């Protein structure tokens, strides 16, 4: 009934896909996704 821990580890690297702010640019070829979605290349 005696429990001994073995330590700790980092099991995953979680990416937080929260939408970032917007930068207004004068370039006509750079764009943004307003919401959920990825450009496919």
């Amino acid at each position: 009934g005696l429990m001994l821990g073995a330590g700790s580890k980092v099991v995953a690297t979680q990416k937080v896909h929260t939408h970032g702010n917007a930068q207004t640019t004068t370039n006509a070829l750079d764009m943004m996704v307003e919401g959920d979605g990825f450009f496919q290349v």
Binding site: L4, A6, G7, K9
Partner: protein, 50 residues
């Protein structure tokens, strides 16, 4: 008279408690959690627990 008694050393068993686990971040390094064994066959070809 029962006055002479010999003593001989013996190996009654082994310490099966969990060892010291070394984290290495290597894919092919596995440590048995708690009690258990891994079946391997030696050079002769006989199954054994490691």
């Amino acid at each position: 008279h029962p006055s002479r008694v010999f003593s001989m050393t013996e190996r009654p068993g082994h310490n099966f408690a969990q060892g010291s686990v070394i984290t290495t971040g290597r894919d092919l390094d596995v440590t048995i959690e708690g009690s258990g064994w891994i079946s391997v066959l030696d050079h002769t070809g006989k199954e054994g627990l490691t």
